[PDB]
Structures are given as structure tokens and as C-alpha cells.
Amino acid sequence: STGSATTTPIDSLDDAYITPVQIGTPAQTLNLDFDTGSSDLWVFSSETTASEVDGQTIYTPSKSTTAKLLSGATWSISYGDGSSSSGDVYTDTVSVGGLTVTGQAVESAKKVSSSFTEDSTIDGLLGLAFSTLNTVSPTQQKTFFDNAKASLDSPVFTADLGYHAPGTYNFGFIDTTAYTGSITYTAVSTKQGFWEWTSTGYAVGSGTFKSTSIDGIADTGTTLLYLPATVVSAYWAQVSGAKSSSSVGGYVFPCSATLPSFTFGVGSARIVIPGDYIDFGPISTGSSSCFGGIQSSAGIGINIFGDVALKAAFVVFNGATTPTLGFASK
Numbered sequence: 001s002t003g004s005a006t007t008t009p010i011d012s013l014d015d016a017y018i019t020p021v022q023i024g025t026p027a028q029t030l031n032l033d034f035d036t037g038s039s040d041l042w043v044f045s046s047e048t049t050a051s052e053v054d055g056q057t058i059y060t061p062s063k064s065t066t067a068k069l070l071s072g073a074t075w076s077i078s079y080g081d082g083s084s085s086s087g088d089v090y091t092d093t094v095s096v097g098g099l100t101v102t103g104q105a106v107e108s109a110k111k112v113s114s115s116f117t118e119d120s121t122i123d124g125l126l127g128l129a130f131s132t133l134n135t136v137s138p139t140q141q142k143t144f145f146d147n148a149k150a151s152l153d154s155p156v157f158t159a160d161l162g163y164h165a166p167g168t169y170n171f172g173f174i175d176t177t178a179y180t181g182s183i184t185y186t187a188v189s190t191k192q193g194f195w196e197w198t199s200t201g202y203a204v205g206s207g208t209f210k211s212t213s214i215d216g217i218a219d220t221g222t223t224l225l226y227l228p229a230t231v232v233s234a235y236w237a238q239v240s241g242a243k244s245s246s247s248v249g250g251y252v253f254p255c256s257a258t259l260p261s262f263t264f265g266v267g268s269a270r271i272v273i274p275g276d277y278i279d280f281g282p283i284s285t286g287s288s289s290c291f292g293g294i295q296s297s298a299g300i301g302i303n304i305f306g307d308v309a310l311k312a313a314f315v316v317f318n319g320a321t322t323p324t325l326g327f328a329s330k
Contacts, residue, residue, distance in 0.1 A: 001151045002172035003099025007034065007161065010121040013280050014307060015223050017161060018122060019169055022095040023106060024064030030057050030123035034169055035221030036159070036195055036317065037304075039133035039143050040077055041094070042085055042107035043124035044116075052112050055120030061108065067092045075107045075135045080222065080300065085112040089136055094144060096126075099171050101148050105134075105141035125221065128157065128317065133193035145171070145319060155319045159220055160330065161311035163277055179314035179328035184269035188323045192302075194219070195317060197325050199305075200267060202227075204235050205260030209270070216303030218315060218325055224280070225262075225273070226297035226304040235262055235294050242292070248283050251292040255282060262294060264309060266327040273312040 018031040046060040061067035076086035087110035094104040152172030199214040236242040242253040259275030278293035316326030
């Protein structure tokens, strides 16, 4: 089997991407944030505290003939950005782009943090990191990909995120029309539960490539590119007026600037992030100070190849017995 679903930016900045997911019988379609940095499929629901729902579409298990309460199971998660949610668990039928999993754990939110409430466009998350990170207790549950894997034509999914445009998540096949050149594959460590890999270096604009190992995670659920302070300083030093602002919470730059590209290495191959991808617009409405799309990972504890990086590539998440990651230009 295979599946193919379009993923769409939630706003004009590509702050996140939503992908329609069918849950239950008859189908209830929710727009979920596909997150390769976590492993819980959770949804706003009829059980979510009413004051914490503001425009989201909810899953109502009582209206699904295939929903079953997973007795005794609860979940609770906290994300890198300080947001959180928690609740109980159903199993139900879940389909993505024509690919169907029966008995998928659907984690129903009883509580969500303010940032989730405040984002009316995201109805929940669909985790695609390794199932070892799944928070369900006392019986840990598998991700959608993990459940689907054996049935897929090939044990892979691909992320093809657009810049200010829709893109695609495919399951079970590699669309050879979706990228240019060849796919370069690179080793993954699953030791922390993430799609963790090591970039071979970077360049700023038309500058020379610096060969240096940068360990990080391929994380579709993070907006920006978080790299070591040395790398980030080198980038923003090429932008006149750019500075790190403690009050704003990162590097800002004059909105009048033309940003240089940023290149990252994947083995001997190179992925080029155009400068425009690194502009996240005014810090506040009407400001001429703009927020940067490359930020320091210092104090995160890990480097994160988020959407800013991933949307410059066609990315293969290879879930073979020894997982690997593949990157191609497009």
C-alpha cells in the first residue's frame, strides 16, 4: 500500500504545516501537524476542556462506530517550545492520503496549553519520530508510520514541504519526479528516539564550505533551523544590522535586508536554503525589525533541522531495519 497527502502552510510565514487526516467511521477529517520530532497522534476532541477550544475541529469518539476506549491509558506531552497537552486514548481507524491503519492509538486531549488553543488551524499532531518516544501509559503505543510499515510497498515516508506553498507527505514510495539529481542517504541514530543525523558542514551565501560535523534532528514539527552559536553567528555576520536580541528571543535583522543563502552538507552533497526562506517577517505588526529563520541551539541541547532546512529538500525518512535519512535538492 501507499498514501499521499498534501500538506499546507498554516499562515504566510510557513510557521507550520497541516495535513488532512481521516479518523473514525464515518470519517472525521482533522488537520494535523505532522511532526517527525515526536511520536504521539493527539487531537482536539469532544473531551477537550471547552474554554481551551477556539475554532479547532474536534474528534468526537462517540460518533465513530470503530472507536474503542483504550482502558486505563493516559498520555501527557511537553514540547521543546514549552507547549503541552494531555488526555486519554482511543483506538480507531486512521487514514492519511488513502493509506489506512486500523487500531491506531488516537490520543484525545482533555487539556491543551494556550499556544494550542490560540492556533485555530491545528487540530492536533501526528507524530512520526520513533515509537520509543510515545507518551501513552501504562502501555506505550505505536506511531501511524510504525503501524503502517509492514503493509507499505517500501518502509519509508517522504516530506516535501513547500516554501510559501503546499507540499506533500508520501507513505510507502519515493516519487522520483519530485526531486532533482540524486538522493544522498546518511546514517541515523535512533538512540534518542529522533531522526538524528550528522550534517557534514555549511556555507554562508557564496562563501567557502566549512567541513564540520553537526549532529541534529530532522524535525518537521519545528519551524526554524537551530544550529550551534558559532555557525549562526557566522551567518548573521553577513547581514548588515543583524543582531541577537535577548528581548525578542533571537537574531533579528532589518526588514530591508536581502538575506544570503545557507548551505548544509549531507555527505558529499549540498542543500541550499535560499535567503528568502530565512525571513520570518516583522517581530511585531508594523515593525521594521524582522525575525531570523536561523537561530542558535545553545541551551536547547540539540541542533534542529526544522522546516526552514527541510523545505529546501526532498527528504526520505527510511524506516528499514536500520533507518537512514535521504536528502535531495528539488
